[PDB]
């Protein structure tokens with residue numbers, strides 16, 4: 001994240017680190033012992049996840065490593081957009097969710113704890129926290145320590161005004177109009193918590209990150225509650 | 237390109253500047269009045285070309301603007317790799333080639349002329365030229381003037397040693413082992429002229445560009461002649 | 473140093489060029505007629521200094537050559553780290569300081585003068601200067617003329633975020649987040665002048681030097697005053 | 709190694725890859741199911757080894773990973789020299805050997821096979837093979853594929869003439885007077901096989917590697933046969 005700070009040790013127990021083998025690629029959110037939530041755009045052949053991490057590059061004994069048995073990308077995400085080198089005006093990136101079923105259940109401890117799905121609808125003006133090991137430079141340099149930033153939930157209008165892509169109902173708009181604070185490359189899939197509640201996850205934003213006047217796009221989690229639950233329950 | 241020089245004025249009438257909306261994204265080679273060659277990885281929905289261009293930020297009346305009717309990416313290029321967030325070890329980027337059918341044929345002036353495909357196979361040691369408006373810095377910054385650079389054709393083992401991806405017969409290894417001279421981001425699709433002869437196209441290379449002991453990959457055009465001719469002859 | 477400029481002639485009479493045989497290896501600071509300060513990691517068996525030097529490849533008569541009688545590395549610097557082939561994560565490089573007793577005292581001319589230790593503690597935001605004949609390229613190449621550069625004193629969290637090693641109270645974080653300006657290899661031991669005041673010495677930084685978002689470490693001299701004075705007063 | 713070539717797949721079954729956690733640091737030689745041989749100068753806190761590797765950065769299913777239970781550096785190697793930033797003239801680097809006892813025996817297969825200690829004394833003029841994943845650039849860039857080079861065994865006189873360090877009886881001298889072919893950074897501990905027999909291991913060489921007229925120093929294995937065997941037998 002850009003313009004953030006070092007989250008407190010173990011303050012974000014639900015924060016996940018998604019890997020493609022030995023390489024960190026995204027952020028995630030732990031929802032249940034066998035279920036992690038991330039962005040549908042973190043597309044790779046095999047997945048591995050790290051729970052309880054604070055230092056991305058140092059091995060902490062209280063962390064937990066796990067393999068992923070299967071991934072369930074939302075059926076609404078247009079995968080075809082990924083092959084494109086440039087985003088076509090009017091492109092719709094709605095439904096940027098994906099569920100990952102861990103092969104071996106995770107051990108809920110002091111260090112690892114899931115977070116509950118939201119029940120209320122996001123209210124603009126709200127103070128939200130974003131977290132991750134995404135780049136700390138607007139254009140790329142990852143940090144060791146997990147980063148945290150505070151941002152404001154803004155009306156979708158704000159985002160739709162400045163983007164060429166479609167800003168839909170299943171999206172959220174948040175950031176700092178003054179720029180300088182924003183999520184960035186590889187923060188994807190990470191959690192967005194407002195007034196202490198999980199409201200959505202990091203999806204896409206401006207190039208460069210923190211561009212003044214251009215907020216970032218997050219998934220509106222409330223709109224997906226059914227699909228998630230349905231998938232969890234239907235899949236052993 | 238990195239470590240090159242401003243190509244002399246109008247020296248390369250075959251250099252194509254492939255745009256998308258108002259911005260340049262790739263390079264290419266003029267092979268006919270209504271046929272342009274480029275990299276399969278320069279994937280976008282709509283295509284536009286500029287010919288007889290020298291400056292990237294200047295109206296040139298000698299210059300010809302056009303549009304592309306149909307694009308034909310080589311049936312071998314694994315497009316799936318493009319959606320992946322990270323390149324897995326062993327990923328084969330062979331056949332990185334794509335033809336672009338023009339809407340309205342190009343007028344052959346002294347500033348806009350084609351180049352023939354080779355019949356002579358390449359031999360290491362040879363001196364080659366590459367050009368484009370790719371970054372002039374190793375990591376980015378596009379130049380106003382078209383850049384040119386001289387590099388040495390190396391045997392494939394030089395590239396294979398350092399690349400985790402597969403280096404094949406349909407590929408060429410070129411650059412300067414000492415580093416400092418190479419093609420960079422957005423030079424893709426441009427031409428590789430070895431001994432006044434077109435031997436291949438800019439596929440990909442290391443990042444940073446011009447990394448010592450890490451040359452770059454180019455398509456071994458000679459292996460695509462049959463295909464190239466058929467696609468023009470059979471179709472449009 | 474990277475991205476600096478040739479220090480004006482004789483502007484830094486305190487800059488010391490620490491040699492070993494015929495070659496320069498480190499920098500240092502003149503604190504007295506018979507006392508030079510440098511980095512504990514500039515470990516060799518015999519020590520030689522040159523003072524009032526501007527060029528590295530030129531006999532300067534204003535310049536004074538000497539020899540070191542006894543060297544006293546700070547009792548805190550873990551010398552063991554120096555034998556290790558790779559730095560383990562968490563390695564603490566605190567107390568990187570070493571005093572050098574001269575054989576024959578230095579004559580104080582207008583070209584060879586000491587500098588006082590600070591009493592004022594440093595505050596972020598400050599503008600600091602660093603100099604030396606370290607590499608002028610990010611990865612090496614020593615300059616003839618002494619280099620100078622201006623950088624900003626940053627809070628320690630900026631360094632800690634990106635360093636796998638421990639960043640402590642006895643350390644300072646300085647550089648330019650944008651990259652391009654920094655100290656490089658063989659600048660170690662040289663001085664850090666913040667607001668016309670000596671605040672610390674070049675300890676270590678990233679490789680490449682001047683890496684964006686990765687500033688460099690310097691010793692927080694203020695924390696070593698008691699020790700520094702005792703070692704001169706008690707001994708030689 | 710510099711100026712070498714890609715060893716044939718699995719041609720050097722005794723070749724070892726020594727790691728400090730996830731980082732490759734040296735080469736080694738497999739002597740027995742529980743014993744690996746490397747340089748005493750590969751100094752780190754914990755050791756791990758990879759057997760049957762051909763690609764250093766790609767995971768091969770026929771490779772073998774193992775942990776090291778204890779290291780036995782030759783009691784004659786002067787460890788104190790490691791803390792030195794510059795080598796003092798006349799420094800003696802004799803006895804650069806170290807034994808590593810694997811925690812779990814290795815499985816001798818087609819891919820992994822130990823090599824026997826030498827019985828005859830090295831004869832000058834001999835054609836020798838050196839191998840490793842050390843730098844491929846004289847000053848650093850490691851390869852994926854294991855590299856092999858052919859060099860000549862030369863009289864010690866040749867080496868003693870050009871080095872400032874002591875060249876002793878327990879050392880060997882080898883290289884190409886024409887320069888260009890030599891071992892390099894991180895080839896350390898690797899095997900040196902002459903006329904099909906293990907004669908010694910890589911120790912130190914010129915900076916840069918392959919410097920014309922400056923051969924490289926390897927350990928004269930025959931002189932250490934007793935100590936090795938004694939250590940193997942005496943240590944469970």
Ligand SMILES: *[C@@H]1O[C@H](CO)[C@@H](O[C@@H]2O[C@H](CO)[C@@H](O)[C@H](O)[C@H]2NC(C)=O)[C@H](O)[C@H]1NC(C)=O
Nearest residue numbers: 043044045046314315316317318320324327328
């Ligand atoms: C084209 O690229 C894709 C992406 O790497 C390859 O697809 C993978 O293939 C393996 C088996 O070979 C599967 O286990 C993975 O799950 C596949 N991933 C996806 C996203 O489908 C594909 O094999 C490549 N094709 C070729 C000919 O190399």
Ligand SMILES: *[C@@H]1O[C@H](CO)[C@@H](O[C@@H]2O[C@H](CO)[C@@H](O)[C@H](O)[C@H]2NC(C)=O)[C@H](O)[C@H]1NC(C)=O
Nearest residue numbers: 078079080081082084088090091092280281282
């Ligand atoms: C997914 O994204 C692609 C690319 O924007 C869409 O494909 C385009 O669809 C329109 C018609 O709706 C065509 O005219 C374009 O030429 C198509 N472009 C390409 C590259 O195929 C696609 O429609 C989007 N949505 C879905 C549901 O597929």
Ligand SMILES: *[C@@H]1O[C@H](CO)[C@@H](O[C@@H]2O[C@H](CO)[C@@H](O)[C@H](O)[C@H]2NC(C)=O)[C@H](O)[C@H]1NC(C)=O
Nearest residue numbers: 516517518786787788789790792796798799800
């Ligand atoms: C190991 O290397 C060190 C450094 O060369 C040797 O220590 C030197 O020993 C001489 C006397 O033989 C002293 O005059 C030097 O001042 C010492 N230098 C240092 C830095 O201690 C040491 O003797 C070498 N050999 C052994 C067996 O220790």
Ligand SMILES: *[C@@H]1O[C@H](CO)[C@@H](O[C@@H]2O[C@H](CO)[C@@H](O)[C@H](O)[C@H]2NC(C)=O)[C@H](O)[C@H]1NC(C)=O
Nearest residue numbers: 550551552553554556560563564751752753754
């Ligand atoms: C000084 O540095 C050395 C090298 O890393 C440290 O020594 C290691 O200490 C651990 C236990 O803390 C042992 O398990 C390792 O085997 C030690 N390695 C060696 C080579 O002795 C030492 O702890 C450091 N000292 C401090 C105070 O940090």
